[PDB]
Amino acid sequence: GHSYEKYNNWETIEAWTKQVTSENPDLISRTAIGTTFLGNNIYLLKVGKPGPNKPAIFMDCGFHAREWISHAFCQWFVREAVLTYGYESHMTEFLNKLDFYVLPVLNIDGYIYTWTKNRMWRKTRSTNAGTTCIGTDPNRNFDAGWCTTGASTDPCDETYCGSAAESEKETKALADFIRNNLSSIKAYLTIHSYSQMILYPYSYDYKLPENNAELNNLAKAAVKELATLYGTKYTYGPGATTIYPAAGGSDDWAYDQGIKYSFTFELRDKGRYGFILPESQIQATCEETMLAIKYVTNYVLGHL
C-alpha cells in the first residue's frame, strides 16, 4: 500500500491521487493536464480551499525519473497540507488565500522504467527517428534558449534536448497548462535531486533576471529556514554559474513567461547516496524542505 515514508511505484501513486482527493474533497481536486508518450495520465492536484479568482503557486516533481526523493516530496507536501489545515495557522492562511497546483510526477514513463528496468534512467521514454536510443531530457525540452548550451543533440545522451522544443507530450502539456493559467500562477517551483541547491534563472545564458536581487535574497532566506531543522546546508544562485549552463529548462521558461518567482529545488544529498537516497531519510528531507516551500509561499503572498 501507499506510504509517505517509502518510495511508491506509479500504480500506487496513481491510486493515491484518487484516494487523497476522495478523502479530502474540501481541500483537493484532481485533473490531468495531458498524457505521456506511453499514454499514462499526467495528474495535477489542486490543493486549497476553493474560491473565486485566487492566485496560485505551481509545483511539480519527477521531471527526472531516477530522482525518487522528488516524487516523494510532492506526496509529502499534499498530506502535510491536508493534515495541518485548520491546525497550523500559516498553512491554513495559505490554503485559504491561494491554491497550490501540485504535479506529483511529470515524467511518469521514465519513472516506471526506473522501477521495471533501469534504476538510473533520467529521460522520457519516447522514440527517436534514425536511432534506437530512447528518450528526451524533459528539462532540456522547453523553449528557453532551446538546445544552445549544456544539452546534447545526440538522442543517446542523457541531456538530449529533443527534436524540437516541446517535442515531448509531457513538456508540451506542462507548458500548455501554465500558458493557459498565467494570470493566476504567481510562482513556479520544480523539485529535483540531488545537490542541495536552490536555483533560479538563468541557466540558458549567463545573463541575469531583472529581479535578480530579489530572487537571490528570497533564495538565501529560504535556505536559512531549511537549515533551521537539521542544519542541512544548501547553496543558492543563478543556475548557470551555480551548477552549470543548461538551456531548455522549465524554470527559465516559466520566468520568461512572466512568472517572477521561479526556482529549481535540488534536494538531498550531496553524493554519499545520490539518487538512491535511503527511505529512512525521506521524512527528514521532506520536513526541512517544507520549511523552505512555506517560506517562499508566504513571500509570494505578501508580494501580490
Binding site: H64, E67, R122, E158, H192, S195, Y244, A246, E266, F275
Partner: peptide, 5 residues
C-alpha cells in the same frame, strides 16, 4: 542531476 556533477 547530470552525471557526474
Amino acid at each position: 542531476x547530470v552525471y557526474a556533477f
